[PDB]
């Protein structure tokens, strides 16, 4: 039994983390084949960041202005290029530890694992979720730029995030591996803020499904509700509106458990209206929204008696 | 900024996970050099898990039935012994991916990362804590036996746990890498009752220091209490007694935040008697006791490996 917020084994990503130094700035880079991917603001100074002209500043830089370090081995940059907000550095030797990979762009509400790195070396791994405001509630410090987010399916590592900056509220923003930011954010020292964040309602119900599988069931009631009568009650507590695809994606869990989707929503309303009465669901006094229904199936397993 | 329940990088441990198949029973092994560590009940069938005479069942076991596989390669076992509750198979090929390692036994209250494996393939990594009742609140399915726990210091992987069994309440019991079970448990799928689980007090205090660093300081009071009067309220709330050795460990955290160790104990006494009044500390309305003082310094400093 048991249920934990679980990350993927970070082995295949550690074999691709290098150290990129341009001038006085040092962040992390992703070494795949003979290319090193890193945030493009590595070429800027603290004064350039207030209004960077990335095309001009990259024109001035040369190949020998980029020190790529794979631990103690110097990596020779034989060409530099740019793609949106990601700098691509061609090197002489291909990474022998390159895994089967693919670049993907996730949707808000999904989950992935972050390998926090500093100076090219890993510090830890945790499980994140792309929030509806296209931010992540990560754990990053100075020098953590270049850290990547990923999901591992079978043997393929689906890279989906590259850290870039932290917002005034302490949350984090980044890009996909093709250089496109998640949200309305830019890599410029300008006034920026995360939008209003809504709770991922489809994830909260999958979390409540995992609790019934794991024995916790005090929140279950005998009453019911309708979708419209639920979609409006949740807006007072700032939850995402439950779409039909959200009710449908909670299907495999509904069959594994035997509690229809509309029945689980009713128990959620009582917990938002009258609180949890000080009790705990899976050891959490709050309602968790960073488990996708796929993560619940991947961990709780469970069978469906067709 | 930010603060997450963060697990160690599992790279140096994945390259050590192999598969061990004896009979129809298959679990995971730990390949270090030319020795494969795994729970000894790989010799047991699912029916012989009630009360097995392991030494007798091992006397009738053979090396050619001991299958060890790393990926596609099959490892040839040249010998086998038994240390307490752990099988030690001797294979021919030394593990080339062997990291600098060490075997340690941890105390109640310490943390470590668990690498859940199935059929020798790692599947997930998460941070866990050795509970005071010597159990762990882990996530294990059928086939997770042999999954190991570990910490990392410098380049040395400090192995400290090996999964063996699941208990009735859902908690899990295991041994160190020398075979000795943690707590009053045995490798027998019988009625084993985990004792009363108390709360790790020093880990909650360290978790409060991380809250002050990350902009959560409403619970900080001006009152002060003694170490004796602090344990008074703790015993009535099922918390471990805070010894002087705990105060000295919280020293570096006390210096960084300019808050006295006992001043934080006064902030904790109010949170125990009066709750938190619908407030959340670091995004949690419950006191988190699975963050050691080192774990707070490790995350808030960006310590790498």
Q: How close does chain B come to A272, measured CA to CA in Å?
A: 13
The CB-side HSE value for A160 (13 A sphere, CA atoms) comes to: 22
Place of tokens 């996970």: B17
Q: How close does chain A come to B7, measured CA to CA in Å?
A: 5
Instruction: Return the number of other C-beta atoms located less than 10 Å from residue A58's C-beta.
Output: 16
Q: Any CB–CB contact under 8 A between A299 and chain B? A: yes
**Domain range for B257:** 199-301
Is A194 in contact with A167 (CB distance < 8 Å)?
yes
Q: Any CB–CB contact under 8 A between B7 and chain A? A: yes
The 8 Å CB, 24+ separation contacts for B96-101 are: B97/B12, B97/B15, B97/B16, B98/B16, B98/B31, B98/B32, B98/B33, B99/B12, B99/B13, B99/B15, B99/B16, B99/B155, B99/B156, B99/B157, B100/B154, B100/B155, B100/B156, B100/B157, B101/B32, B101/B156, B101/B157, B101/B158, B101/B159
Residues 6+ apart with CB under 8 A from A185: A134, A164, A165, A167, A173, A192
Q: Any CB–CB contact under 8 A between A141 and chain B? A: yes
Q: Any CB–CB contact under 8 A between A96 and chain B? A: no
Q: Any CB–CB contact under 8 A between B209 and chain A? A: no
Q: How close does chain A come to B61, measured CA to CA in Å?
A: 31
- Cβ-based contacts of A172 with chain B (< 8 Å): 2
Measured CA angle at A71 (ends A67, A73), to 5 deg: 65
- Cβ-based contacts of A117 with chain B (< 8 Å): 304
The CB-side HSE value for A109 (13 A sphere, CA atoms) comes to: 21
Phi, psi of B62 (to 5 degrees): -125, 155
Write out the catalytic residue numbers of B. Answer: 41, 145
| Distance from C-alpha of B121 to C-alpha of B139, rounded to nearest angstrom | 16
| Distance from C-alpha of B38 to C-alpha of B16, rounded to nearest angstrom | 12
- Could you give the C-alpha distances from A210 to A193, B139, B207, B281, in angstroms and in order? 34, 12, 27, 24
Q: How close does chain B come to A207, measured CA to CA in Å?
A: 15
Q: Which residue of B has its CA nearest to A12?
A: B11
Cβ–Cβ gap B3/A214 under 8 Å: no
Cβ–Cβ gap B125/A126 under 8 Å: no
Instruction: Return the number of other C-beta atoms located less than 10 Å from residue A300's C-beta.
Output: 22
DSSP output for B163-185:
EEEE-TTS-EEEE-TTSPBSSS-
| Distance from C-alpha of B206 to C-alpha of A111, rounded to nearest angstrom | 28
| Distance from C-alpha of A157 to C-alpha of A93, rounded to nearest angstrom | 21
Measured CA angle at A208 (ends B141, B131), to 5 deg: 50
Phi, psi of B72 (to 5 degrees): -90, -25
Residues 6+ apart with CB under 8 A from A51: A188, A189
Specify the experimental method.
Answer: X-ray
Q: Is A145 tagged catalytic?
A: yes
Measured CA angle at A139 (ends B208, B279), to 5 deg: 40
Q: Any CB–CB contact under 8 A between A139 and chain B? A: yes
Instruction: Return the number of other C-beta atoms located less than 10 Å from residue A37's C-beta.
Output: 26
Nearest to A170 among B2, B172, B284 (CB): B2
CA B164 to chain centre: 13
Q: Any CB–CB contact under 8 A between B124 and chain A? A: yes
The first and second tokens of residue A211, run together, are: 């609790």
The helix/strand/coil state of A209 is: helix
First to last CA, chain B: 20
Cβ–Cβ gap A299/B14 under 8 Å: no
Q: For chain A, give me the number of helices (H) and strands (E)? A: 8, 13
Residues 6+ apart with CB under 8 A from B251: B261
Q: For chain B, give me the number of helices (H) and strands (E)? A: 8, 13
| Distance from C-alpha of B106 to C-alpha of A39, rounded to nearest angstrom | 40
- Which has the closest alpha carbon to B268: B229, B295, B305? B229
Q: How close does chain A come to B11, measured CA to CA in Å?
A: 4
CA dihedral B178, B179, B180, B183 (to 10 degrees): 120
Residues 6+ apart with CB under 8 A from B275: A278
The helix/strand/coil state of A2 is: coil
Q: Resolution limit in angstroms?
A: 2.5
- Cβ-based contacts of A285 with chain B (< 8 Å): 284-286
Q: Any CB–CB contact under 8 A between B108 and chain A? A: no
Q: Is A164 tagged catalytic?
A: no
Measured CA angle at B89 (ends B86, B91), to 5 deg: 155
- Could you give the C-alpha distances from B21 to B46, B66, B67, in angstroms and in order? 13, 6, 5
Q: Where are the alpha helices (DSSP H) in chain B?
A: 11-14, 54-59, 201-213, 227-235, 244-249, 251-257, 261-273, 293-301
First to last CA, chain A: 23
Residues 6+ apart with CB under 8 A from A275: none
Instruction: Tell me the CATH number at A241.
Output: 1.10.1840.10
């Amino acid at each position: 039994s048991g249920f934990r917020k679980m990350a993927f084994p970070s082995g295949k990503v550690e074999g691709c983390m290098v150290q990129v130094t341009c001038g006085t700035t040092t962040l992390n880079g992703l070494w795949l084949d003979d290319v090193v991917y890193c945030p493009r603001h590595v070429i800027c100074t603290s004064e350039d960041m207030f209004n960077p002209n990335y095309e001009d500043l990259l024109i001035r830089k040369s190949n020998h202005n980029f020190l790529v370090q794979a631990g103690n081995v110097q990596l020779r940059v034989i060409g530099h290029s740019m793609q949106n907000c990601v700098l691509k550095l061609k090197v002489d030797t291909a990474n022998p530890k390159t895994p089967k990979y693919k670049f993907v762009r996730i949707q808000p509400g999904q989950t992935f694992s972050v390998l926090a790195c500093y100076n090219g070396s890993p510090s830890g791994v945790y499980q994140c979720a792309m929030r509806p405001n296209f931010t992540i509630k990560g754990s990053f410090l100075n020098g953590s730029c270049g850290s990547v987010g990923f999901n591992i399916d079978y043997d393929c590592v689906s890279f989906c995030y590259m850290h870039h900056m932290e917002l005034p509220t302490g949350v984090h923003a980044g890009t996909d591996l093709e250089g496109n930011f998640y949200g309305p954010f830019v890599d410029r020292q300008t006034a920026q803020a995360a939008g209003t964040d809504t709770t991922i309602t489809v994830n909260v119900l999958a979390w409540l499904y995992a609790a019934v599988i794991n024995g916790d069931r005090w929140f279950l009631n005998r009453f019911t509700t309708t979708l419209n009568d639920f979609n409006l009650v949740a807006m007072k507590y700032n939850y995402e509106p439950l779409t039909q695809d959200h009710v449908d994606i909670l299907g495999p869990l509904s069959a594994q458990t035997g509690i229809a989707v509309l029945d689980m929503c009713a128990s959620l309303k009582e917990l938002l209206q009258n609180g949890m009465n000080g009790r705990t669901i899976l050891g959490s006094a709050l309602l968790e929204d960073e488990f996708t229904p796929f993560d619940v199936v991947r961990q709780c397993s469970g069978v469906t008696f067709q």
